[PDB]
Amino acid sequence: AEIYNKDGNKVDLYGKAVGLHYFSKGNGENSYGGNGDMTYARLGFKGETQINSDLTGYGQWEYNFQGNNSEGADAQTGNKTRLAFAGLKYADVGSFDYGRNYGVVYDALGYTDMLPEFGGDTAYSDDFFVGRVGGVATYRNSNFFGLVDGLNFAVQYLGKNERDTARRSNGDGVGGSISYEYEGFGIVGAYGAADRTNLQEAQPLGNGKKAEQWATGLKYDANNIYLAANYGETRNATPITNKFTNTSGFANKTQDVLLVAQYQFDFGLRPSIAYTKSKAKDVEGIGDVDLVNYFEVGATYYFNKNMSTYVDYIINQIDSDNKLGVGSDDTVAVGIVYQF
């Protein structure tokens, strides 16, 4: 909701309150999504100022407040800043911003990241180029300088981030994306590679000095119809855990397939059908193991642009024999979301 707009500068203060609950058998420790209260809220602001006819300055910040914690010691569990950056758009030259933003390879994965609750399984956070990462400089260009309609590209530099964890770290890397959209249709290609930190190489799982992520997307968006499919692979980038030996690291190689089919009825119902399978290859010792595998049936009902509720149901195609210990149970999510 735009709360301010004077002197060529408008500030949009958005957010939302999401009452959420997960339903799975047992404690939910062996299920796909877990079990129990998952309530949370959002807050943030999109700022945009017109420096002049061609020049636009902008900034954004988005935080995540968990609502399923107590007010005691664990009050903080789950809270974090999701986005935080600032930049400039210029005429038909393109735009540039820096801070914590999405990785270029998400330009592709975004296509199937549409499910009511789950989905977008291969878009991990702080995982190089496939999700939200810190310290990325992103240049983007629309309509190839205004010369070609529907043709966009983007180049991105990922600063070295040597954190405490192997999972949340990353060396220096570059990446890019070319996407063309023409009348309901869109095709996207994204790729990126980066140095792995010492702590990352020192891990038992995963072998190499270089991380790679590429994904291509194809979608038809129009007429209340949303059809999208994603295919991508990774080298020493997807984080995995062997729950049996308590080993941590990265999967030498992964192949990812996301499929989504949704329809928006006029009275406000939007049923969703999705399939996701992410298999890892050459997992030292295990060999080939499925990390994610399921069919998704769900629907979101929009009372309007502010209110809505949804049921998201994951039919877990992982079996109890999973070599890494990936949960094999189903998970149903029920949500009731207000937002401004």
Q: Give the C-alpha separation, 85 to 99, whole Å.
A: 4
- What is the nearest approach in angstroms of its own copies to the Cβ of residue 286? 25
Residues 23-62 close enough to bind its own copies by CB under 8 A: 36-37, 39-41, 43, 45, 47, 49, 51, 55, 57-61
Region near its own copies per CB under 8 A, out of 217-225, 247-255, 281-289, 297-305: 297-305
Pairing of strands 94-102, 132-141: antiparallel
Region near its own copies per CB under 8 A, out of 154-162, 272-280, 282-290, 314-322: 154-162
Q: Which of 65, 180, 263, 295 binds its own copies (CB under 8 A)?
A: 65
3-state helix/strand/coil string of 130-185: CCEEEEEEEEEECHHHHCCCCEEEEEEEECCECCCCCCCCECCEEEEEEEEEECCE
Q: Of 78 and 208, which has the nearer Cβ to its own copies?
A: 78
Residues 67-126 close enough to bind its own copies by CB under 8 A: 67-76, 79-88, 97-100, 125-126
Which segments within the chain are labelled E, that is strand?
2-6, 9-23, 36-37, 40-50, 55-66, 80-90, 94-102, 132-141, 151-158, 173-182, 185-195, 210-222, 225-235, 239-242, 247-250, 253-263, 269-283, 287-301, 307-316, 331-339
Residues 168-187 close enough to bind its own copies by CB under 8 A: 168
Q: Of 231 and 338, which has the nearer Cβ to its own copies?
A: 338
Q: Of 87 and 173, which has the nearer Cβ to its own copies?
A: 87
Region near its own copies per CB under 8 A, out of 10-18, 217-225, 315-323, 324-332: 10-18
**Is residue 135 part of the contact set for its own copies (CB under 8 A)?**
yes
